[PDB]
Design an enzyme around this catalytic site. Structure first.
Site, PDB file in Angstrom:
ATOM      1  N   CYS A   1      35.315  43.086  54.821  1.00 31.81           N
ATOM      2  CA  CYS A   1      35.295  44.319  54.039  1.00 31.81           C
ATOM      3  C   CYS A   1      36.088  45.368  54.820  1.00 31.81           C
ATOM      4  CB  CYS A   1      33.857  44.746  53.721  1.00 31.81           C
ATOM      5  SG  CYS A   1      32.860  45.210  55.148  1.00 31.81           S
TER       6      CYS A   1
ATOM      7  N   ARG B   1      29.155  45.563  53.405  1.00 31.54           N
ATOM      8  CA  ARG B   1      29.315  44.426  52.505  1.00 31.54           C
ATOM      9  C   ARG B   1      29.469  43.097  53.237  1.00 31.54           C
ATOM     10  NH1 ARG B   1      34.084  46.922  49.116  1.00 31.54           N
ATOM     11  NH2 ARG B   1      34.419  47.764  51.221  1.00 31.54           N
TER      12      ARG B   1
ATOM     13  N   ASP C   1      31.848  49.053  47.034  1.00 31.53           N
ATOM     14  CA  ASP C   1      31.489  49.796  48.237  1.00 31.53           C
ATOM     15  C   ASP C   1      30.206  50.587  48.004  1.00 31.53           C
ATOM     16  OD1 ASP C   1      31.287  51.202  50.574  1.00 31.53           O
ATOM     17  OD2 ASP C   1      33.354  51.939  50.581  1.00 31.53           O
TER      18      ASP C   1
END
Length: 105
Positions: free
Chosen positions: A6, A12, A85
């Site tokens: 990420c 994430r 996100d």
């Protein structure tokens, strides 16, 4: 060896790494930006039911389009129609929902 990527490697892809570890027949994660190197995963993402250090490789999977482009591979998502996100806790559970679908093995 599987590497999940990420942006900051604190929300994430750290989640992706632990979900895949649990699903696995036996992963690592990293980030395109090094601004969070050394940090633990985001306190909110570690908090959940649902066990989650940031580091900045070309391993034998990108969280969103920016990580990917604009060995490299949501296209393993089979149920839910990016891994998104600055949000409340419900966005964190959605990340987990998408990774339990996508986590490929």
């Amino acid at each position: 060896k599987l590497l999940f990527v990420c942006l900051g490697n604190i929300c994430r892809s750290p989640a992706a790494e632990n979900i895949m570890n649990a699903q696995i027949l036996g992963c690592d994660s990293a980030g395109t930006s090094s601004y969070h190197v050394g940090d633990s995963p985001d306190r909110r993402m570690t908090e959940s039911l649902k066990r989650v250090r940031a580091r900045q490789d070309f391993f034998d999977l990108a969280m969103d389009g920016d990580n990917y482009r604009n060995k490299v591979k949501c296209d393993y998502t089979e149920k839910f129609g990016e891994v998104p996100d600055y949000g409340g806790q419900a966005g964190f559970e959605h990340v987990i929902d998408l990774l339990e679908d996508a986590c490929l093995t």
